[PDB]
Amino acid sequence: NVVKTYDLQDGSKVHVFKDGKMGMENKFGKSMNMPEGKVMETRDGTKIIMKGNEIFRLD
Amino acid sequence: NVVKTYDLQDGSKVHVFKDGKMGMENKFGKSMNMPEGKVMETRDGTKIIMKGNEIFRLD
């Protein structure tokens, strides 16, 4: 179902689904409200940001 | 002097200069500030967004 998952510094995660949908979870796996316009950083140092339910990655 | 250029669908351009500074030009070549927190569509399809003086690109 998930086509991609971002593994964020803070232990939270963002799943991207086959259907274009997106979902974020805290370090406890509980579902969260995803922040818009806020830079998030992955485990491996990649910076991303969400806007209009799409994901942008630091170029 | 211009290290990177994005050609947008609205006729304007974004420049990233060799120094680090960032600017936009309009259709007429008029230099302006880089719009922050706004998605912009490139002629070649991509969308970008600037936040805190970093460019992020659709993933």
Ligand SMILES: [Cu+2]
């Ligand atoms: Cu999960």
Ligand SMILES: [Cu+2]
């Ligand atoms: Cu120019």
